[PDB]
Amino acid sequence: PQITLWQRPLVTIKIGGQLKEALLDTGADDTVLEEMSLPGRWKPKMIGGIGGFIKVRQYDQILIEICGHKAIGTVLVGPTPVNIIGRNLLTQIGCTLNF
Amino acid sequence: PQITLWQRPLVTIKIGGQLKEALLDTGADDTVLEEMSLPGRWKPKMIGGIGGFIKVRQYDQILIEICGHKAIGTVLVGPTPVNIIGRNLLTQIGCTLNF
Numbered sequence A, B: 001p002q003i004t005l006w007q008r009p010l011v012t013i014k015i016g017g018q019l020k021e022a023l024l025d026t027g028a029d030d031t032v033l034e035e036m037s038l039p040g041r042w043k044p045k046m047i048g049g050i051g052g053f054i055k056v057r058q059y060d061q062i063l064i065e066i067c068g069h070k071a072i073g074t075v076l077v078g079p080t081p082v083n084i085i086g087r088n089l090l091t092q093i094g095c096t097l098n099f
């Protein structure tokens, strides 16, 4: 699909059997979802942005589907204001910026 | 041009006639630049991100050129780690996400 940027680029993902809405974000190196139970072990990590650092749990090799495109990769879960799909999974689904 | 997302999407911009580097960020509503003195009066504003809020000064009607494409709009200046070009200016240069 070709997404214009007049509105926030929010899409539907499927994660853990669950549907959620998430922002396609080229500024983020990582994927950060709001707090949720995923199956598997996790380890604590900190990540930062404007404002500061938050503590997240890192889960590895998680399957996700973004508009029907599968990606398998690391997902951080923590008190994010919004679910963010970062470059780790955008490259998997073949996303580019074009102008 | 087309930009892959294996690396952070940093490009050169020109603002006041100097080159700087900045991240093309589809997750940002606003454009946020490193501290600089611009002529012009401003309005105070608070912006949020992952870890909390910071304070910035809002200037209106700034011309930037992103990789040769002009855009004119609001810019927020404050102590950001990175210069961020958000959607407010990305739409003006005809930027899309494609997968």
Ligand SMILES: CC(C)[C@H](NC(=O)N(C)Cc1ccccn1)C(=O)N[C@@H](Cc1ccccc1)C(O)(O)C(F)(F)[C@H](Cc1ccccc1)NC(=O)[C@@H](NC(=O)N(C)Cc1ccccn1)C(C)C
Residues within 6 Å of the ligand: A008, A023, A025, A026, A027, A028, A029, A030, A032, A047, A048, A049, A050, A081, A082, A084, B008, B023, B025, B026, B027, B028, B029, B030, B032, B047, B048, B049, B050, B081, B082, B084
């Ligand atoms: C710059 C801010 C104004 C902007 N806020 C914003 O647009 N809103 C609050 C409005 C909004 C937008 C969408 C939804 C809701 N509300 C913002 O931080 N928006 C970010 C996404 C987000 C939206 C809403 C709430 C929390 C995060 C973002 O798009 O700018 C981002 F995710 F790309 C920001 C851009 C950034 C990078 C580095 C430092 C500071 C900022 N990245 C991050 O926050 C991410 N951090 C990250 O990628 N880091 C630290 C590595 C990095 C990347 C690039 C360069 C250097 N270092 C985390 C999510 C893991």
